[PDB]
Design a binder for these strands. Structure first.
Length: 111
DNA sequence: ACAACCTCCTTAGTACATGCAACCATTATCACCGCCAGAGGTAAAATAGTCAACACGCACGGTGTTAGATATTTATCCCTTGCGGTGATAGATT
């Protein structure tokens, strides 16, 4: 909390608009074309996975749709049962354990 | 009317070429502290969720048996050795 000053006020590292440059005026296609590539690669893998499980594991934080909804418009495209609609966003940690499961996903730190 | 000339005045314009090795400090200097911003905090409820319960249900891995492969053993076979007999080479001539 003293380095608050000393991290930048000596002669300033390249911090574009500190970190807020992620959400500023740059959100235009000058950045979001890479979002429309991470979204493509996650849309690929999360549509080859299990015929039930392949919905859930896209919800809450903005993953796949221009409004990445809670239950109502997603459950009506999942059918049969309930909040497996959310739990499978995390289930992947334990039998998608096989680290090869990201072989087509990781490039979007780099394009 | 000027002209440049005698003398030592000072000014200041430059100082050849190729390459390798090293590490990146010193300052002080009341920023006061007053105000209040939207803005930090967090309570209570939106955007919606945790993971424990009791169920559900499955994969994976280790113990066991089986399989067959492999490396050994054996023994066969061929390709090679070294010497020898005598080869037509090397090359000079026709």
């Amino acid at each position: 909390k003293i380095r608050k000053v000393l991290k930048i006020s000596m002669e300033t590292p390249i911090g574009d608009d500190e970190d807020s440059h992620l959400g500023i005026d740059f959100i235009e296609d000058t950045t979001s074309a890479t979002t429309e590539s991470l979204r493509a690669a996650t849309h690929d893998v999360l549509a080859g996975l299990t015929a039930r499980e392949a919905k859930v594991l896209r919800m809450r934080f903005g993953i796949d749709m221009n409004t990445d909804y809670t239950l109502e418009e997603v459950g009506k495209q999942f059918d049969v049962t309930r909040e497996r609609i959310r739990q499978i966003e995390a289930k992947a940690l334990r039998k998608l354990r096989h680290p090869s499961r990201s072989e087509v996903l990781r490039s979007f730190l780099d394009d």
